[PDB]
Design a protein around this ligand. Structure first.
Ligand SMILES: NC(=O)c1ccc[n+]([C@@H]2O[C@H](COP(=O)([O-])OP(=O)(O)OC[C@H]3O[C@@H](n4cnc5c(N)ncnc54)[C@H](OP(=O)(O)O)[C@@H]3O)[C@@H](O)[C@H]2O)c1
Ligand SMILES: C[C@H]1NCCc2ccccc21
Lengths: 282, 282
């Protein structure tokens, strides 16, 4: 039961469709290029002829396409068939793109959720999958159970752009953290330290016990316990850069991190908090 | 000997915490500091103050040193050359691994056992649950004093070579600085929409950091085996273009994601997995 249509059958859209099939939904699939539907049809999906049939088959339409232009092109022809259905858009962009899609959906009498997929395709549907959602709370509550088949659905608020905002923010932190980890791994690696054991120490202990706790301790709105003054952290970074040079590891990462603190010291004091670094960017 | 005499040389905020922790665990603690005015609070708690460094060293077989740098260690302890014979130095503030190896050499020249250690928590956490200290140096010396060292924090022995503790410490902290900075960009980005920092912080630290950042790191780490991974360099460039785009829309400085994207563009040109970025630095 709970018929669902998936539009877009790239690697992510295919995973969405397959996860929905595995929970036993009546899944209708649609894609622009041919040949992406066959593997899903084999697994029990009905392929729709035209986008109107696809949209008409289900009250819930899960969209996973390249951008907003792609969404309009794909779903534009559906016209009055969208009226009274719900679009769950899993591929915005930026928050302005999310708001543009909300506008498009509302013009067509269509409910709208914007979602960010927080795991790779292969994790979709499996324990650990988490999807962030923004949009009408009524709509979210009505389709929550269906959405749960893809991953733990977290509703951030009713404004269209929030999911993309949170997703882009979290991912920005992820890239920096991963790059720092790779500097770390290069550093120990240059002494011949085996990576597996260091990785486990860094991820299973240091990341939650030290990095997480220090972040919360620096957050002025939230361990006894903080990162210490800017000036003491500058000195720490000078030792990291020194160590990196000794070991023959590129100093780019700690050099940039030190320059950032130097800027924050100059704007405030050597005694200002670590968190005040954020004032350089807003 | 559960009340083993210990001397602490250096009574800055960390050294003072070490001394207080040792006093709480039933040691006869002798304290020393170059500048006056730091010993009195510890004397009140039961520490014996030493006049000069020779008296300090002569009072205990175990000497815990917590000074600014290596130069400070040599200048402080130099006069006590001879008194050091047959004692053990646990140096808790080497700046680089070459410095750790220099101090080993100095200690051994004088007939003195040597451990190097890195304190992984702030002063206020020292001697409380969650305190962790990393050690490197002679396994025999570590085994002999392990139980005393356990009073300060969980003692993790990395190996016998003098520089390992500094190497691991500098690596882990390098990752920390990058992670915190990426978090601050994240917080600025959601903050620019009026999202409250407390709730975002909790989501980022209590869920995203272990469930996503930690797992993606392990997935990329070729020696550890989350059926997915970070995806190709090229897909991550595109993701970063969206983060930069979102950051511009929101009026938040793009410095952090711009640098992260430039790194990947360098890695694409060198010519593939996210983890291969590491090859730019060694
Ligand atoms: O680590 P933390 O948080 O404890 O603080 P820290 O700022 O890293 O330094 C703490 C200790 O380093 C000592 N120190 C610095 N230069 C020295 C020298 N040339 N000779 C002897 N001692 C020296 C300080 O002596 P003073 O407290 O005598 O300046 C202080 O006791
Ligand atoms: C350098 C100091 N300040 C930042 C927090 C921290 C955490 C672990 C070990 C040292 C430090």
């Amino acid at each position: 039961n709970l018929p669902v249509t998936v539009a877009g059958l790239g690697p992510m859209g295919s995973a969405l469709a397959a996860a929905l099939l595995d929970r036993g939904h009546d899944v209708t699939v649609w894609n622009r290029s041919p040949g992406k539907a066959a593997p899903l049809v084999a697994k029990g999906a009905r392929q729709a002829d035209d986008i109107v049939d696809a949209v008409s088959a289900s009250r819930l339409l899960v969209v996973c396409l390249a951008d907003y232009d792609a969404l309009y092109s794909a779903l534009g022809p559906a016209r009055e068939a969208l009226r009274g259905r719900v679009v769950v858009n899993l591929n915005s962009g930026t928050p302005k793109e999310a708001n543009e899609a909300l506008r498009w959906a509302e013009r067509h009498g269509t409910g709208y959720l914007d979602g960010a997929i927080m795991v790779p395709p292969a994790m979709v549907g499996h324990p650990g999958s988490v999807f962030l959602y923004s949009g009408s709370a009524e709509v979210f509550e009505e389709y929550k159970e269906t959405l749960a088949g893809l991953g733990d659905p977290v509703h951030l608020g009713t404004e269209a752009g929030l999911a993309v905002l949170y997703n882009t923010a979290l991912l920005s932190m992820m890239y920096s953290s991963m790059n720092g980890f790779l500097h770390a791994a290069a550093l120990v690696g240059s002494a011949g330290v085996p990576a597996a054991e260091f990785t486990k120490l860094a991820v299973d202990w240091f990341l939650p016990a030290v990095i997480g706790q220090i972040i919360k301790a620096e957050a002025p709105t939230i361990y006894p316990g903080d990162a210490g003054s800017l000036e003491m952290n500058v000195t720490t970074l000078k030792h990291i850069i020194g160590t990196s040079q000794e070991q023959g590891v590129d100093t780019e990462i700690p050099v940039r991190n030190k320059e950032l603190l130097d800027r924050a010291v100059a704007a405030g004091f050597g005694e200002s908090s670590y968190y005040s670094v954020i004032e350089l960017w807003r």
